[PDB]
Amino acid sequence: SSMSYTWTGALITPCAAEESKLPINPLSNSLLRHHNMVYATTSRSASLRQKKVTFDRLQVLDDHYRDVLKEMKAKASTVKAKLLSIEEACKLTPPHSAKSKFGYGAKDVRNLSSRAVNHIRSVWEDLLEDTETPIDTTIMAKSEVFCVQPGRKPARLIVFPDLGVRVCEKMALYDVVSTLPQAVMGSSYGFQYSPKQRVEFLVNTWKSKKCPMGFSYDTRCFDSTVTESDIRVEESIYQCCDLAPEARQAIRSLTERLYIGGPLTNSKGQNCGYRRCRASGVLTTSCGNTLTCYLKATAACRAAKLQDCTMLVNGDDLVVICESAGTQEDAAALRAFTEAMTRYSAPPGDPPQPEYDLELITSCSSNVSVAHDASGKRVYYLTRDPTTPLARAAWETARHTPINSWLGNIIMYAPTLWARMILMTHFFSILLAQEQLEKALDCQIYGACYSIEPLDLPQIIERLHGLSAFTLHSYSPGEINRVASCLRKLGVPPLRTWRHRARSVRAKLLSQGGRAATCGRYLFNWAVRTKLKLTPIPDLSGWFVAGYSGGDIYH
């Protein structure tokens, strides 16, 4: 056997009191009235999750797999990757990253304190001198907010090494994980695209097929499906880069000591068990998942004899668009695809279904939809079911949180009916009332943390989505119906209320002048009776280059 996890009986413990409900009394009640619908996961459901993620992996590799792997390595062998200096790696550490057990924290790392850098150097030397000893990790239950569904999701489990080790991962591997995936997978590497670019790729791919069929593939507990073999195959791809000798060794040692597995320690310092699958909180998780998903999926496409496939991969998230052969034979091919993924260790959660309308394909929890701009031209844009974004926004209104998913959701889904009507109106109202428009806030974009001034949103949205994001109307019936239904479920006030609120915050923003007034003019033009003509506004290099989920990255 090869078990994803072995358990001792020690509990997955919280490090502090955990909240699972919105506070009693108002705050987010003006956002949504059905507060009992909103919950946050805690350590109290850790054991339900442990049951789902724990199983034996039988893996059977074939010629298709080996062929694809060799192709990927040929492309990987064009890459030259550089060691990051200590200073560069320290600057990529988020200011609230989990402190080291060696008596320094994220702020000390970022300041290059004596104790921090002493430890980081000792850890680096230790990777070079010790090639075997498993590296300790901490296991914790993740706190995430959802809406109930007619019951409740258990907490996800996060597994991560000590801050000192995380700084060493950046030095050995940041350049690799930021450059290799695109070198290997080209246009298939989803993290290279902004939302507009993603939409474009999907639409152009779909229109390029004589008769398109598409499907999303959901692997059940992907991280747990990843084998020790997969993780060594992943290293085999990394080792094709030109690398400094210390980087080669650090990659070698990290692979055997950390990435393939190791001991799990709870917040109380007790041994909880042992992992032999992917850790969610290491630098290589997004890259590793993306490579492994792509490899397995490309080989399965061949085994299924699916014709003219174009794939788009974002970590464990997969969508394929191919040439239809007919209904019955697409169904059969998709079953063979699944059978081969299952042999490769990646069985499905939701059984995949062939889809003949691009708009009904959900990938990265998002779908393509269509609206029209001021002049009436069709504009394709990315949207999703707003339930989770709105539940999270109510939580962040009522309780202090370091990550502001509302701000990330505005950036990624600015064109949508729901982000504009609700999230912009609600959060600009609070910010303006609290006199904090100017204050920068943390949010996440493809797993990395960015500090963003709310007043820069008009500029950010134009660059990313186009001027069109401020003028979209004539949304599709499908999208409208989903929005309305979600908003009934959560008890969100009607359009009239948001329109009034938006007119009011728009008035106050305009009177302040400057970036505030720009926010009023562009973000809230939908709210006014007599629309204004909107025009172009007088460094996003690192944005939408790569994914870093769990990889402890800041900018």
CB closer to ligand 55W, 128 vs 507: 507
488 binds ligand 55W (CB under 6 A): yes
Question: Closest Cα to residue 505, out of 22, 30, 23, 29?
Answer: 30
According to CB under 6 A, which residues from 354 to 373 bind ligand 55W?
Answer: none
Size of residue set near ligand 55W by CB under 6 A: 16
Contact criterion met (CB below 8 Å) for 302 and 331: no
C-beta atoms surrounding 374 within 10 Å: 15
Using rule CB under 6 A, residue 417 touches ligand 55W: yes
Cα 140 from chain centre: 19
State the nearest-atom distance from the C-beta of 473 to ligand 55W, in Å. Answer: 4
Of 159, 492, 516, 546, which one interacts with ligand 55W (CB under 6 A)?
492
In terms of CB distance, is 488 or 500 closer to ligand 55W? 488
The verdict on 500 binding ligand 55W (CB under 6 A) reads no
Q: Report 508-527 residues binding ligand 55W (CB under 6 A).
A: 526
For residue 421, state whether it binds ligand 55W (rule: CB under 6 A). Answer: yes
Query: d(Cα 36, Cα 95) in Å, to the nearest integer?
Result: 33
Residue 66 near ligand 55W by CB under 6 A: no
Helix, strand, coil share of the chain (percent; to 5): 50, 15, 35
List binding-site positions: 218, 316-317
If the CB atoms of residues 173 and 371 are measured against ligand 55W, the closer one turns out to be 371
DSSP string over 343-360: HTT--BSSPP--BSSGGG
391 binds ligand 55W (CB under 6 A): no
The H-or-E segment that residue 76 falls in is: helix 63-76
Mapping DSSP to helix (H, G, I), strand (E, B) and coil, where does residue 306 land?
A: coil
Rounded to a whole number of angstroms, the minimum distance from the CB of residue 484 to ligand 55W is 4
Assess 534 for contact with ligand 55W (CB under 6 A).
Answer: no
Does residue 374 bind ligand 55W (CB under 6 A)? no
Q: What is the closest distance, in whole angstroms, from the C-beta atom of residue 481 to ligand 55W in the complex?
A: 9
Binding site members for Mg(2+)? 218, 316-317
Which of 10, 158, 460, 484 is in the footprint of ligand 55W by CB under 6 A? 484
Task: Name the residue nearer to ligand 55W (CB basis): 38 or 92.
Answer: 38
Tokens describing residue 296: 């397995």
State the pairing for strand pair 262-265/137-141.
parallel
The residue among 138 and 525 lying less far from ligand 55W, judged by its C-beta, is 525
Q: Which residues of 165-198 are buried (b: 16+ CB within 10 A; e: fewer)?
A: bbbbbbbbbbbbbbbbbbbbbeebbbbbbbbbeb
CB of 530 to ligand 55W, least distance (A): 11
**Residue 306: which of 361, 357, 354 has the closest Cα?**
354
- Half-sphere exposure (Cβ direction) of 384: Cα atoms closer than 13 Å: 16
Contact between 473 and ligand 55W per CB under 6 A: yes
- The label of the residue with tokens 């809406």 reads 147
What is the amino acid identity at position 192? Q
Q: Is 160 in the site for ligand 55W (CB under 6 A)?
A: no
Smallest distance, Å, CB 498 to ligand 55W?
6
Q: Phi/psi of residue 361, each to 5°? A: -80, 120
Binding residues for ligand 55W (CB under 6 A)? 417, 420-421, 473-475, 480, 483-484, 487-488, 492, 494-495, 498, 526
